[PDB]
Coordinates of all heavy atoms in Angstrom, one line a residue:
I1 N 76.8 17.3 88.1 CA 76.7 17.5 89.5 C 76.4 16.0 90.1 O 75.6 15.4 89.6 CB 75.7 18.6 90.0 CG1 75.9 19.9 89.3 CG2 75.7 18.6 91.4 CD1 74.8 20.8 89.5
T2 N 77.3 15.8 91.2 CA 77.0 14.5 91.9 C 76.7 14.8 93.3 O 77.4 15.7 93.9 CB 78.1 13.5 91.8 OG1 78.4 13.2 90.3 CG2 78.0 12.3 92.5
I3 N 75.6 14.3 93.8 CA 75.3 14.3 95.3 C 75.2 12.9 95.8 O 74.4 12.1 95.4 CB 74.0 15.1 95.6 CG1 74.0 16.4 94.9 CG2 73.6 15.1 97.1 CD1 72.6 17.2 95.0
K4 N 76.1 12.6 96.9 CA 76.0 11.4 97.6 C 75.4 11.8 98.9 O 75.8 12.7 99.5 CB 77.5 10.8 97.7 CG 78.1 10.5 96.4 CD 79.5 9.9 96.6 CE 79.5 8.6 97.1 NZ 80.9 8.2 97.4
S5 N 74.7 10.7 99.5 CA 74.3 10.8 100.9 C 74.6 9.5 101.5 O 74.2 8.4 100.9 CB 72.7 10.9 101.0 OG 72.4 10.9 102.4
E6 N 75.4 9.5 102.6 CA 76.0 8.3 103.2 C 75.7 8.2 104.6 O 75.9 9.2 105.3 CB 77.4 8.3 103.0 CG 77.8 8.3 101.4 CD 79.2 8.3 101.2 OE1 80.0 8.4 102.1 OE2 79.6 8.2 100.0
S7 N 75.1 7.1 105.0 CA 74.7 6.9 106.4 C 74.7 5.4 106.7 O 74.8 4.6 105.8 CB 73.4 7.6 106.8 OG 72.4 6.7 106.3
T8 N 74.5 5.1 108.0 CA 74.2 3.7 108.4 C 72.9 3.2 107.7 O 72.7 2.0 107.6 CB 74.3 3.5 109.8 OG1 73.2 4.3 110.5 CG2 75.6 3.9 110.4
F9 N 72.0 4.0 107.5 CA 70.7 3.6 106.9 C 70.9 3.2 105.4 O 70.4 2.1 105.0 CB 69.6 4.7 107.0 CG 68.4 4.6 106.1 CD1 67.7 3.4 106.2 CD2 68.1 5.6 105.3 CE1 66.5 3.3 105.3 CE2 67.0 5.5 104.5 CZ 66.2 4.3 104.5
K10 N 71.5 4.1 104.6 CA 71.6 4.0 103.2 C 72.7 4.7 102.6 O 72.9 5.8 103.1 CB 70.4 4.1 102.4 CG 70.1 3.4 101.1 CD 69.7 2.0 101.4 CE 68.3 1.8 102.0 NZ 68.0 0.4 102.2
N11 N 73.4 4.4 101.6 CA 74.2 5.2 100.8 C 73.6 5.3 99.4 O 73.2 4.3 98.8 CB 75.6 4.5 100.6 CG 76.4 4.4 101.9 OD1 76.2 5.1 102.9 ND2 77.3 3.4 101.9
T12 N 73.4 6.6 99.1 CA 72.7 6.9 97.8 C 73.7 7.8 97.0 O 74.5 8.6 97.5 CB 71.4 7.6 97.9 OG1 71.5 8.8 98.5 CG2 70.4 6.7 98.6
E13 N 73.4 7.8 95.7 CA 74.2 8.7 94.9 C 73.4 9.1 93.6 O 72.8 8.2 92.9 CB 75.5 8.0 94.3 CG 76.3 8.8 93.2 CD 77.7 8.2 92.9 OE1 78.1 7.2 93.6 OE2 78.3 8.6 92.0
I14 N 73.3 10.4 93.3 CA 72.6 10.9 92.0 C 73.7 11.7 91.3 O 74.4 12.5 91.9 CB 71.4 11.6 92.3 CG1 71.5 12.8 93.2 CG2 70.3 10.7 92.9 CD1 70.3 13.7 93.3
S15 N 73.7 11.6 89.9 CA 74.4 12.5 89.1 C 73.5 13.1 88.1 O 72.7 12.3 87.6 CB 75.6 11.8 88.5 OG 76.6 11.4 89.3
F16 N 73.6 14.4 87.7 CA 72.7 15.0 86.9 C 73.3 16.2 86.3 O 74.2 16.8 86.8 CB 71.3 15.3 87.7 CG 71.7 16.1 88.9 CD1 71.6 17.5 88.8 CD2 72.0 15.6 90.2 CE1 71.9 18.3 90.0 CE2 72.4 16.3 91.2 CZ 72.3 17.6 91.2
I17 N 72.5 16.7 85.3 CA 72.8 18.0 84.6 C 71.6 18.9 85.0 O 70.4 18.4 85.0 CB 73.0 17.9 83.0 CG1 74.2 17.0 82.9 CG2 73.0 19.2 82.4 CD1 74.4 16.6 81.4
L18 N 71.8 20.1 85.4 CA 70.8 21.0 85.8 C 69.7 21.1 84.6 O 70.0 21.3 83.4 CB 71.3 22.5 86.1 CG 72.1 22.4 87.4 CD1 72.9 23.9 87.5 CD2 71.4 22.2 88.7
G19 N 68.5 21.0 85.1 CA 67.3 21.2 84.2 C 67.0 20.0 83.4 O 66.1 20.0 82.6
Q20 N 67.8 19.0 83.5 CA 67.6 17.6 82.7 C 67.1 16.5 83.5 O 67.8 16.0 84.5 CB 68.9 17.3 82.0 CG 69.3 18.5 81.1 CD 70.5 18.1 80.1 OE1 71.0 17.1 80.0 NE2 70.9 19.2 79.5
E21 N 65.8 16.1 83.3 CA 65.2 15.0 84.1 C 66.0 13.8 84.1 O 66.6 13.3 83.1 CB 63.8 14.8 83.5 CG 62.9 14.0 84.2 CD 61.4 14.2 83.9 OE1 61.2 14.2 82.6 OE2 60.5 14.4 84.8
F22 N 65.9 13.0 85.2 CA 66.4 11.8 85.4 C 65.6 10.9 86.2 O 64.7 11.3 87.0 CB 67.9 11.8 86.0 CG 67.9 12.5 87.4 CD1 67.9 11.7 88.5 CD2 68.0 13.8 87.4 CE1 68.1 12.4 89.7 CE2 68.1 14.5 88.6 CZ 68.1 13.7 89.8
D23 N 65.7 9.6 86.1 CA 64.9 8.7 87.0 C 65.8 8.2 88.1 O 67.0 7.9 87.9 CB 64.6 7.4 86.2 CG 63.5 7.6 85.1 OD1 62.5 8.2 85.4 OD2 63.6 7.1 83.9
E24 N 65.1 8.3 89.4 CA 65.9 8.0 90.6 C 65.2 6.9 91.4 O 63.9 6.9 91.3 CB 65.8 9.4 91.3 CG 66.4 9.4 92.6 CD 66.4 10.8 93.4 OE1 65.7 11.7 92.9 OE2 66.9 10.7 94.5
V25 N 65.9 6.0 92.1 CA 65.3 5.2 93.2 C 65.7 5.9 94.4 O 66.9 6.0 94.8 CB 65.7 3.7 93.1 CG1 65.1 3.1 94.3 CG2 65.3 3.2 91.7
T26 N 64.8 6.4 95.2 CA 65.0 7.1 96.5 C 65.4 6.2 97.6 O 65.3 4.9 97.5 CB 63.8 7.9 96.9 OG1 62.7 7.1 97.3 CG2 63.4 8.9 95.8
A27 N 65.9 6.6 98.7 CA 66.4 5.9 99.8 C 65.2 5.0 100.4 O 65.4 4.0 100.9 CB 67.1 6.7 100.9
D28 N 64.1 5.5 100.3 CA 62.8 4.9 100.9 C 62.2 4.1 99.6 O 61.1 3.6 99.8 CB 61.8 5.9 101.4 CG 61.3 7.0 100.4 OD1 62.2 7.6 99.8 OD2 60.1 7.1 100.2
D29 N 62.9 3.9 98.5 CA 62.6 3.0 97.5 C 61.4 3.4 96.6 O 60.7 2.5 96.0 CB 62.2 1.5 98.0 CG 63.6 0.9 98.6 OD1 64.7 1.4 98.3 OD2 63.6 -0.1 99.3
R30 N 61.2 4.7 96.5 CA 60.3 5.3 95.4 C 60.9 5.3 94.1 O 62.2 5.6 94.1 CB 59.7 6.6 95.8 CG 58.7 6.6 96.9 CD 58.4 8.2 97.3 NE 59.4 8.7 98.1 CZ 60.1 9.8 97.9 NH1 59.7 10.7 97.0 NH2 61.1 10.2 98.6
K31 N 60.3 5.0 93.1 CA 60.8 5.3 91.7 C 60.2 6.5 91.2 O 59.0 6.7 91.0 CB 60.3 4.1 90.8 CG 60.8 2.7 91.2 CD 60.7 2.3 92.7 CE 59.4 1.6 93.2 NZ 59.5 0.8 94.4
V32 N 61.1 7.7 91.1 CA 60.6 8.9 90.8 C 61.3 9.5 89.6 O 62.4 9.1 89.2 CB 60.8 9.8 92.1 CG1 60.2 9.3 93.3 CG2 62.3 10.2 92.3
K33 N 60.5 10.5 89.0 CA 61.2 11.3 88.0 C 61.6 12.6 88.6 O 60.8 13.4 89.2 CB 60.2 11.6 87.0 CG 59.8 10.3 86.0 CD 59.2 10.4 84.7 CE 59.0 9.0 84.1 NZ 60.4 8.6 83.7
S34 N 62.9 13.0 88.5 CA 63.5 14.0 89.2 C 64.1 15.0 88.3 O 64.6 14.7 87.2 CB 64.7 13.5 90.1 OG 64.2 12.8 91.2
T35 N 63.9 16.3 88.6 CA 64.6 17.4 87.9 C 65.3 18.3 89.0 O 64.5 18.7 89.9 CB 63.6 18.2 87.0 OG1 63.0 17.3 86.2 CG2 64.4 19.2 86.2
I36 N 66.5 18.8 88.8 CA 67.2 19.6 89.7 C 67.6 20.8 88.9 O 68.2 20.6 87.9 CB 68.3 18.9 90.4 CG1 67.8 17.7 91.1 CG2 69.1 19.9 91.3 CD1 68.9 16.9 91.9
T37 N 67.2 22.0 89.5 CA 67.6 23.3 88.8 C 68.2 24.1 89.8 O 68.1 24.0 91.1 CB 66.3 23.9 88.3 OG1 65.4 24.0 89.3 CG2 65.7 23.2 87.0
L38 N 68.8 25.2 89.4 CA 69.3 26.3 90.2 C 68.5 27.5 90.1 O 68.5 28.0 88.9 CB 70.8 26.6 89.9 CG 71.9 27.1 90.8 CD1 71.9 26.4 92.1 CD2 73.2 26.7 89.9
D39 N 67.8 27.9 91.1 CA 66.9 29.0 91.0 C 67.3 30.1 91.9 O 67.2 29.9 93.2 CB 65.5 28.5 91.3 CG 65.1 27.3 90.2 OD1 65.3 27.6 89.0 OD2 64.5 26.2 90.6
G40 N 67.8 31.2 91.5 CA 68.2 32.2 92.5 C 69.2 31.7 93.6 O 69.2 32.1 94.7
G41 N 70.1 30.9 93.1 CA 71.2 30.4 94.0 C 70.7 29.2 95.0 O 71.6 28.7 95.7
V42 N 69.6 28.7 94.7 CA 69.0 27.6 95.5 C 68.9 26.4 94.5 O 68.4 26.5 93.5 CB 67.6 27.9 96.0 CG1 67.0 26.7 96.7 CG2 67.6 29.2 97.0
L43 N 69.4 25.3 95.1 CA 69.4 24.1 94.2 C 67.9 23.4 94.6 O 67.7 23.1 95.8 CB 70.5 22.9 94.7 CG 71.8 23.1 94.0 CD1 72.7 22.1 94.7 CD2 71.5 22.7 92.5

């Protein structure tokens, strides 16, 4: 899955597999460990 967020502030892009952690630099410049799952139809 790829999620892009595009604006005048920042363009970001993350790609991931559900349930598989990844390291992300957020639009506000935090360095985070992220996990995305699908839980009852909610990402």
Side-chain angles (χ1 to χ4, degrees):
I1 304 168
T2 300
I3 303 174
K4 299 180 72 190
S5 177
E6 304 179 349
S7 78
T8 57
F9 166 56
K10 206 82 63 180
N11 296 334
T12 66
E13 170 169 355
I14 60 172
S15 294
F16 57 91
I17 297 169
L18 293 167
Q20 299 194 5
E21 186 162 48
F22 58 96
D23 292 309
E24 178 182 6
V25 177
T26 68
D28 62 303
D29 295 347
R30 288 174 287 131
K31 293 51 88 159
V32 309
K33 292 201 173 290
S34 283
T35 309
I36 302 179
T37 55
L38 212 34
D39 301 317
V42 176
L43 277 171

